[PDB]
Copies of this chain bind each other. A is one copy, B any other.
């Protein structure tokens, strides 16, 4: 229960979010301020994780016993103390991914959902008109996927590059593995993988070296998959602003997948005896 703010910060980090809940709390921020930050973080994380739940309202808040409560549409879904896997299980029945790992739910709920591979001439007509609208997924520049919707005064541009948690973890672990120099430690990891796989060898070495059960990785369940760029006012009705926003969104995505993966690699060294 003393790890709950830090566990949360750490869950937000998998999405490139710097929530700073443990810090906020230790500075004696009031509860309203902590709850507003829990919620803004969770919402930002939801735009990156690619679970496909733009149609739900996401909230989080402190409880008296020191826990953090995660809500969807004002209903409790999980508490941070139940663990990161549990939070993933609570979201799973709300999700509907296709085989590309893209959410099949709409973002709007009420409105028109256009084909994602429309002519720009036609998408321009949708963007310049007042009504809310929404576009379905399609491929996009740089081996991405993209869609867009508008809710009132804001245009939401989503770019995704799906990846499973497990695959993104394997990559960070590989990078750690590939850089070990101590020959004795190398030989230890070879043996361990006999029974445990390469992952598993690395994870067992962190626990053994730290002489404790280290905090489970929220990266086993969550990872950066997408970025949502936002536009407002006149710009949210301008087709060239939209096109510029797609490149922005794609560039930010690449950046988040880059540092979050490097940050997982550095955390994975925690506890390693190396030498």
Neighbour of A198 across the interface among B170, B179, B183, B190, CB < 8 A: B190
Q: Mark A168-179, 1 if CB is under 8 A from B, else 0.
A: 001101100111
Contact A197 B186 (CB under 8 A): no
Q: A171-B187, A194-B197 are in contact. List 19 more A-B contacts (CB 8 A).
A: A167-B187, A170-B186, A170-B187, A170-B191, A171-B183, A173-B190, A174-B180, A174-B186, A174-B187, A174-B190, A177-B177, A177-B178, A178-B180, A189-B198, A190-B197, A190-B198, A193-B193, A193-B197, A197-B197
From A164, which residue of chain B is reached at the shortest CB distance? B187
Interface status of A200 (Cβ within 8 A of chain B) = yes
9 contacts between A and B (CB under 8 A): A167-B183, A170-B186, A170-B190, A190-B198, A193-B197, A194-B197, A197-B197, A198-B198, A198-B201
Cβ-defined contact, B193 with A171, below 8 A: no
A123 within 8 A of B: no
Interface centre among A171, A174, A178 (most CB of B within 10 A): A174
Give chain B residues whose Cβ lies under 8 Å from the Cβ of A189.
Answer: 198
Minimum CB–CB distance from A225 to chain B (whole Å) comes to: 16
